[PDB]
Enzyme design. Sequence first.
Site, short mmCIF file in Angstrom:
data_model
loop_
_atom_site.label_atom_id
_atom_site.label_comp_id
_atom_site.label_asym_id
_atom_site.label_seq_id
_atom_site.Cartn_x
_atom_site.Cartn_y
_atom_site.Cartn_z
N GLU B 30 0.83 -1.20 0.00
CA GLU B 30 0.00 0.00 0.00
C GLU B 30 0.86 1.24 0.00
OE1 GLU B 30 -4.24 -0.74 2.23
OE2 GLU B 30 -3.17 1.10 2.79
N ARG B 46 -0.87 -11.40 1.26
CA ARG B 46 -2.03 -12.22 0.90
C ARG B 46 -2.82 -11.61 -0.26
NH1 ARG B 46 -6.67 -8.72 2.34
NH2 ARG B 46 -5.97 -7.48 4.14
#
Lengths: 91, 90
Positions: B30, B46
């Site tokens: 992110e 993930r």
Amino acid sequence: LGYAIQCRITTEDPLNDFMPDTGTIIAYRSSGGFGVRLDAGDGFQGAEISPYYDSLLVKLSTHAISFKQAEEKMVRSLREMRIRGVKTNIP
Amino acid sequence: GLSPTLRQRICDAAIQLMENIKYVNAGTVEFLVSGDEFFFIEVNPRVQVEHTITEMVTGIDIVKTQILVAAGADLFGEEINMPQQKDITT
């Protein structure tokens, strides 16, 4: 981008010389999934099938990065299918 | 809208990170962006709920790959079939 495969699910009996079967579907389940596209024609739990048109239950198209990949995607969907009360070209 | 080289840098940042710590399987870096700079926020180690979307523009089954990497398999091999970096786009 990658490769795709298409085929049609009809009521042609691969044992019978592909004479399209007629009559009424009593059970219809379909795979989807990422990479899969379904273009339903006469396939759904109600349809009674007329002898009158080119039989075509579902247009099945798949799409992965490797041709072999898209091939498996197709197979599973064929397998995952479920039509009842008319023979089908699926096998 | 974001400049074609301002994305490439953000893309490059991510990669520099995970390459430095030898990351195995899918993850998401992110970033927070403003003007002409990125700032690193978090890593989701993930699949993200929103994976499909990236798979639609890049043509890779992400999930399918997760399993194959786990399986011991190779990124650029017969089984995963990942296209070379300079070949991957959208």
